[PDB]
Write a protein that binds this ligand. Sequence first.
Ligand SMILES: OC[C@H]1O[C@@H](O)[C@H](O)[C@@H](O)[C@@H]1O
Ligand code: NA
Ligand SMILES: [Zn+2]
Length: 227
Amino acid sequence: GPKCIQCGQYLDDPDLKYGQHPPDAVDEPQMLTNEKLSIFDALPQHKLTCFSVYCKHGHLCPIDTGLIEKNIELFFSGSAKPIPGGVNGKNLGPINEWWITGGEKALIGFSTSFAEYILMDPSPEYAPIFGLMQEKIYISKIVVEFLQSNSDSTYEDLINKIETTVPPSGLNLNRFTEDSLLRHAQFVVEQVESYDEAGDQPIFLTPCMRDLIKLAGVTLGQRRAQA
Ligand SMILES: OC[C@H]1O[C@@H](O)[C@H](O)[C@@H](O)[C@@H]1O
Ligand code: NA
Ligand SMILES: [Zn+2]
């Protein structure tokens, strides 16, 4: 059958899910405007709950399969609060970047051109897709996040950060060991390099990255041997 030219999902797939929003849901521009008036009565981050992520045609999509980085537009919806009653938003974005943020729990966050959103609970329709978050891309975000904030980090510091990071339960991920990192060494170093080559001291040069780059060149078993 025919595919969506945005996300590649089959239109006639019985598992295909569309985004839903309550009738009073508004635009990101509408939401941010209303908000300006409320603080008049500056630019904080938002909590976003009962959230969904989708392509421009409304197909529910993964955050982490490369769509964003390929410059395919991902839109999102949910109930937003600036930062424990929210405002219903729909077709927010697109997402320019997703990232990790923190009590030792690493939460998914989105940047649009206008605002930042910390993701709380998925909508029940989105939950199984959010649940398919991969270990390697989440680990990558943790790595990138940890090295931005700690430019002098050693490999031991990194493994510690990884081992103690609890994924939120919506991600449906096991706790991480040193093996979680080692098994994805190559993917991780590609992600760190990609981050460095994209914007603006590079995290690729951090002492612990030197170690990871080297471990990326050895068989998985031999990486483990060095654990
Ligand atoms: O750690 C959280 C921060 O990560 C950065 O990479 C993003 O640009 C910010 O939007 C975010 O607040
Ligand atoms: Na998962
Ligand atoms: Zn689509």
